[PDB]
């Protein structure tokens, strides 16, 4: 693991980035907390100040819209 | 104290001592990035 690999590892994917930017910020933060950071659903509802229904609805809807946004799948 | 093969175990003092200790080998001079080596051939074409 060189300094070259370490410096390029820091840069964003700029493909998953764009696809996430296309998602609604309300659903983007939800899929972030529940998937990237892996919070429990109640704790995500605690962080976003919104109840459980809102959180899980944004969760699955943003999941679907992101699924439709990216087809690369590591090619 | 000899490990299998009767070689003397490198002690905490051996890490500092000698030309291969920390001071000589790893502190006074080190291996660097952006460096290479190769065989040298004469070029009379070149300027100084």
């Amino acid at each position: 693991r060189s300094a070259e690999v370490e410096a390029l590892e820091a840069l964003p994917d700029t493909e998953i980035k764009e696809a996430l930017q296309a998602l609604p910020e309300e659903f983007r933060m939800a899929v972030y907390y529940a998937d990237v950071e892996g919070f429990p659903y109640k704790e995500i509802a605690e962080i976003m100040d919104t109840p459980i229904g809102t959180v899980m609805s944004r969760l699955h809807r943003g999941r679907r819209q992101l699924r439709g946004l990216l087809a690369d799948v590591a090619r | 104290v000899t490990g299998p093969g009767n070689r003397p175990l490198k002690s905490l003092s051996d890490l500092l001592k000698g030309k291969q200790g920390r001071f000589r080998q790893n502190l006074l001079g080190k291996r660097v990035d952006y460096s290479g080596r190769s065989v040298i051939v004469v070029g009379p074409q070149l300027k100084l």
């Binding site: 070259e4 992101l66 | 920390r22 660097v32 990035d33 290479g36 004469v42």
Partner: protein
């Protein structure tokens, strides 16, 4: 002239003026004799009868006789091993090298047990182990790699006296060491004050009277024998105690610390250490040395090899009488022994342990451990249930043999660049190793050429580096004594006549006689015409003596020379430095796609090639039945078929390709011993390490300045110096903590185009051309997901990836390496194959590259003239002869005279004479210059092959004569005048060069040092995990070490920022490296350096030594040296769009 002792060998006309009365023995005999002795093969049997050593006893048989019998402490039961026997080999050599095995044969013994109580006998045949076997080429195969056992130089057992001057006072103190083949050492010394004492096992020196009275002597008895020595009388006057039993008890307390003294255990230990044959091994060589040195028992009493009380008395009397130094000394039973100190480097006192003795010495230890196990079993086991099978545990013997062949210093990776390298490697003599002197004990005086090395060890061939004088090649005519000495043949001179009776002499027997020289005037009958000849003195000093006193004469010149060194033409015209470099550089030459025998050589190419073992030879006279590129089948006059398979494009240990090509056609009649097919560097049976090139000796526009070399581009276009280089790549899929690795074409996040050269397995396909970074074997490894990417965990959590979480560990091509995939072999755990634990699959891909000659490649001749290629000009730029023939290689003039290698110039002259051929005019002929040597060298057709044997080569007058009768070219022009020079035309401007330049044909070798191997570059790469500095080595993609002296230079320049940048942001600053790469990538300025991580490692190392180290602020207290983890989260959360 003809050298017709070898059938079918090409006719190399020899300038030799002297007949060869003895022929070069088997160059590998130093190895085969040793191993055939160790086994006891019938070849070795027959040999012994001839030797007259009627008592034949093998090495294994000897270890068995020393071990037998094995008696229990009660004496009730004994176990004796009787007969060693070998089952056939387990696998052939090729299969061993392919499957990473060891070429071995099962070893059986006949273990007879006897119970004296019940008086019962149980014989058996017990399996000792799989014994590694020596090949027909004299090598071994260990774990799939070919290896050679180097003969070790060790001092023979015996007593050795030395004169130690340079005490505190200018007073000669004499010391003596009694050194056995095994046991406890003995040492007798004298001090600054006059005394005599015995230093035993490094213990403090006790007066020798203690040992005298401990062996039973009384004061009245020892005072008699040493009465003429007042030093012994003074030591007895200064003696602490006088008595026998108290001497025993004091010797005991000297041997025994921390435990109470006792007289009974004193007697037992003192009698067991030396005179008991168990703990003390006096060698047969050692008994012979001591019985010749002290002359005590000369009436053939070899019945027992152990110290006799008379020989200790003789050693002490010798020590004390050596202070007086009277020549004749007579032990009470001894015989007129000369009293003199012993030379440690003399080859009469310095023997060599060959491979058989080293293997025997490891087997002895293993078997002694097995004997311990046998004695342990003899108690706990129920009698009437034991068998010789249940007593014997062969684990320590197998472990001993494995440890030897794997880790011993004397078991060396075989060096095979060309046949010659392996040939000499098998004949090397190494002074370092276990049982010999260590590396820090090697002084200048052990490395120098000893006068006893004449005809035994070559003084020219030896390493240039730190191993100088420590590794030396065995001479050509020398052979190893059964005792381990080196003998050299001579010619017995009776009544001043020289007969054909050859007598081999050791260094001991030689110094009694005065030896003549190989170059000597001889009456047609045989006698010296010169009044006084030059000879080697017993002292070794040269002198003059008449012809009736000469006892022996050299069998031949080159007697003192090794194989590789005797292949240098006009060696006698080169200095030992450049001759050494030439001998060492011959065996560094790579093989070429086709091998061209040298136009000018010695008689050693043929013999060295066929003895090297890389050539195919006919074992029996017959006619070739079939010839293919794959094999050659011959039909003997017996009617029996014999077939030889060709080694085709097989990689050697060093990467040089070893091809074999048939030199015979279908239907040819071959005599036994003829060469059937050439090896890598052989040509029609002769060693060809390079090419015959047209050379011009002149400085050319500075491109050959300071040892560089200018080449004709022809040598590229015509593949003259092109060589094939094979390299092996290996990768294995194993079981990790996360699961098992898989070798598969399925590689995530990879294009189909780069995978196009891979089969369904993920392995590259045979015949594809590979470039830097091309995938050789696809391999995926289960990823722990702890380092999994947050943006990738997004994918795994949203898309529900379940089955395969892997990463790309696939094998790729290293930097700067490219070629054509030759072969692929694969081993699978799914199939039946032996693989290490956890390793599922293991695949090897072989890749060959055709390397043309190029800038930087290393060329050298046989005369120590080296150099890299500065430039390769087009065939037009090269200076050309009058007929338009461009020279092939331009060697700078300034390099010849100062280096004292003028054999290259004579080689060039004779090479032109051999290229164009010559016809000496013989109408009223026999010109006085050509009368002496030339027999049928009078005329020679163009491109003839001739030989100049070292010290018998063509004389200067004969070469100057040949330079005149040079045959013209096809146009009738004589292109090279009688001066060896010629007019050359500058191929650039066209004007001819004003002066005639020496041109000719020189043998040039491509040494194995190529730019394709040596070029390296690293912007960034892997680091060592401990000190965080860049790794080292081209293989590891390492960086260059900027050492201490380089920092001294940088400081002397006063360049501070360069020194800091080299030492902080390029090497050890973990946060500065990625910062610098990021800054340059984004085109910004370079930031400020941080702290070297190795300094933190130093501080932690000091803290681990109970040293409280603290970095203080300007005025503050200790400063926190580590960093918080929250510095890296902001930019990550921002890149994810928080």
């Amino acid at each position: 002239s003809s050298n017709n002792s070898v059938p079918g060998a090409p006719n190399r006309v020899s300038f030799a003026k002297l007949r060869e009365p003895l022929e070069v023995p088997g160059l590998l005999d130093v190895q085969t004799d040793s191993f055939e002795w160790l086994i006891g093969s019938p070849r070795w049997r027959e040999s012994a009868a001839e030797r007259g050593d009627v008592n034949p006893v093998g090495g294994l048989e000897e270890v068995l006789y020393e071990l037998s019998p094995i008696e229990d402490f009660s004496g009730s039961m004994s176990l004796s091993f009787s007969d060693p026997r070998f089952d056939d080999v387990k696998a052939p050599v090729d299969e061993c090298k392919d499957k990473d095995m060891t070429y071995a044969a099962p070893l059986f013994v006949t273990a007879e047990f006897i119970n004296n109580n019940t008086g019962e006998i149980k014989s058996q045949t017990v399996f000792m182990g799989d014994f590694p076997m020596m090949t027909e080429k004299g090598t071994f195969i260990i774990n799939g790699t070919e290896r050679v056992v180097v003969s070790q130089l060790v001092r023979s057992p015996g007593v050795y006296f030395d004169e130690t001057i340079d005490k505190s006072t200018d007073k000669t103190l004499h010391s003596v060491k009694v050194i056995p083949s095994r046991g406890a050492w003995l040492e007798f010394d004298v001090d600054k004050r006059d005394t005599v004492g015995v230093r035993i096992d490094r213990k403090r020196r006790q007066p020798v009277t203690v040992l005298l009275k401990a062996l039973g002597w009384t004061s009245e008895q020892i005072v008699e024998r040493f009465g003429f020595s007042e030093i012994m009388r003074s030591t007895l006057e200064k003696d602490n105690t006088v008595g026998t039993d108290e001497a025993l008890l004091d010797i005991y307390r000297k041997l025994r610390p921390g435990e109470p003294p006792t007289k009974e255990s004193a007697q037992t230990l003192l009698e067991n250490l030396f005179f008991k044959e168990k703990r003390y091994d006096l060698a047969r060589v050692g008994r012979y040395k001591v019985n010749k040195k002290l002359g005590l028992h000369v009436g053939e009493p070899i019945t027992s090899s152990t110290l006799t009380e008379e020989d200790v008395v003789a050693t002490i009397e010798y020590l004390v009488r050596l202070h007086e130094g009277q020549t004749t000394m007579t032990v009470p039973g001894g015989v007129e022994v000369p009293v003199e100190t012993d030379d440690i480097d003399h080859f009469g006192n310095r023997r060599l342990r060959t491979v058989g003795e080293l293997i025997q010495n490891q087997i002895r230890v293993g078997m002694s451990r097995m004997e311990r196990v046998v004695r342990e079993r003899m108690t706990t086991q129920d009698v009437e249930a034991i068998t010789p099978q249940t007593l014997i545990n062969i684990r320590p013997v197998v472990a001993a043999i494995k440890e030897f062949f794997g880790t011993s210093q004397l078991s060396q990776f075989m060096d095979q660049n060309n046949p010659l390298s392996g040939l000499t490697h098998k004949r090397r003599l190494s002074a370092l190793g276990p049982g010999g002197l260590s590396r820090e004990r090697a002084g200048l005086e052990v490395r120098d050429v000893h006068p006893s090395h004449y005809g035994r060890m070559c003084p020219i061939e030896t390493p240039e580096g730190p191993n100088i004088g420590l590794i030396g090649s065995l001479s050509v005519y020398a052979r190893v004594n059964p005792f381990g000495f080196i003998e050299t043949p001579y010619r017995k001179v009776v009544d001043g006549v020289v007969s054909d009776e050859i007598v081999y002499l050791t260094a001991d027997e030689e110094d009694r006689h005065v030896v003549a020289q190989a170059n000597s005037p001889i009456d047609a009958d045989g006698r010296f015409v010169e009044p006084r000849v030059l000879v080697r003195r017993k002292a070794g000093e040269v002198e003059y003596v008449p012809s009736s006193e000469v006892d022996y004469m050299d069998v031949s010149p080159r007697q003192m020379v090794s194989v590789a060194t005797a292949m240098i033409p006009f060696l006698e015209h080169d200095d030992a430095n450049r001759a050494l470099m030439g001998a060492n550089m011959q065996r560094q030459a790579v093989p070429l796609v086709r091998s061209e025998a040298p136009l000018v050589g010695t008689g050693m190419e043929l013999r060295a090639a066929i003895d090297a073992g890389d050539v195919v030879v006919a074992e029996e006279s017959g006619v070739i039945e079939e010839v293919s590129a794959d094999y050659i089948t011959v039909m003997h006059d017996n009617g029996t078929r014999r077939t030889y398979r060709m080694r085709k494009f097989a990689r050697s240990n060093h990467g040089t390709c070893a091809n074999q090509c048939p030199i015979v056609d279908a239907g040819d009649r071959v005599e036994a011993g003829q060469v059937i097919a050439d090896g890598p560097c052989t040509d029609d049976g002769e060693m060809a390490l390079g090419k015959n090139l047209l050379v011009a000796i002149m400085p050319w526009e500075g491109h050959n300045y300071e040892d560089a070399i200018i080449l004709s581009n022809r040598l590229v276009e015509e593949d003259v110096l092109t060589s094939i280089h094979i390299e092996e790549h290996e990768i294995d899929a194993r079981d990790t903590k996360l699961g098992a690795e898989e070798i598969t074409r399925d590689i995530p996040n990879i294009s189909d185009e780069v995978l196009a050269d891979l089969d369904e397995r993920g392995i590259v396909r045979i015949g594809a051309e590979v470039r830097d970074g091309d995938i050789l074997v696809g391999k995926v490894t289960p990823k722990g997901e702890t380092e999994l990417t947050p943006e990738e965990r997004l994918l795994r959590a949203i898309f529900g990836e379940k089955a395969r979480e892997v990463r790309d560990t696939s094998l790729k091509v290293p930097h700067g390496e490219s070629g054509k995939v030759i072969g692929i072999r694969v081993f699978s755990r799914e199939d039946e194959d032996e693989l290490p634990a956890g390793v599922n699959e293991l695949v090897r891909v072989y890749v060959a590259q055709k390397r043309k000659i190029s800038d930087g490649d290393k060329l050298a001749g046989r005369h120590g003239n080296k150099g890299v290629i500065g430039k390769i000009l087009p065939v037009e730029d090269m200076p050309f002869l009058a007929d338009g023939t461009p020279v092939d290689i331009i060697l700078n003039t300034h390099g010849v005279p100062r280096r004292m290698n003028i054999g290259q110039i004579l080689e060039t002259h004779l090479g032109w004479c051999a290229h164009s051929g010559w016809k000496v005019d013989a109408a009223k002929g026999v010109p006085d210059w050509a009368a002496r040597l030339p027999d049928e060298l009078l005329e020679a057709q163009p491109n003839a092959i001739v030989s100049t044997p070292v010290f018998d080569g063509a004389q200067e007058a004969e070469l100057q004569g040949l330079l005149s009768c040079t045959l013209p070219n096809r146009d009738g022009d004589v292109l090279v005048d009688a001066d060896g020079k010629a007019m050359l035309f500058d191929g650039r401007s066209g004007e001819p060069f004003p002066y005639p330049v020496t041109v000719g044909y020189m043998y040039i070798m491509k040494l194995h040092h190529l730019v394709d191997d040596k070029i390296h570059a690293r912007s960034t790469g892997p680091y060592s995990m401990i000190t965080q500095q860049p790794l080292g080595g081209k293989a590891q993609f390492g960086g260059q070490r900027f050492g201490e002296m380089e920092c001294w230079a940088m400081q002397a320049y006063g360049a501070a920022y360069t020194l800091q940048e080299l030492l902080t942001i390029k090497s050890d600053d973990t946060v500065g490296r990625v910062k610098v790469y990021e800054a340059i990538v984004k085109g910004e300025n370079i930031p400020e350096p941080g702290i070297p991580e190795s300094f933190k490692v130093l501080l932690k190392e000091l803290q681990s030594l109970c040293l409280n180290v603290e970095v203080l602020s300007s005025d503050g207290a200790a400063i926190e040296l580590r960093e918080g983890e929250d510095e890296d989260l902001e930019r990550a959360a921002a890149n994810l769009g928080i």
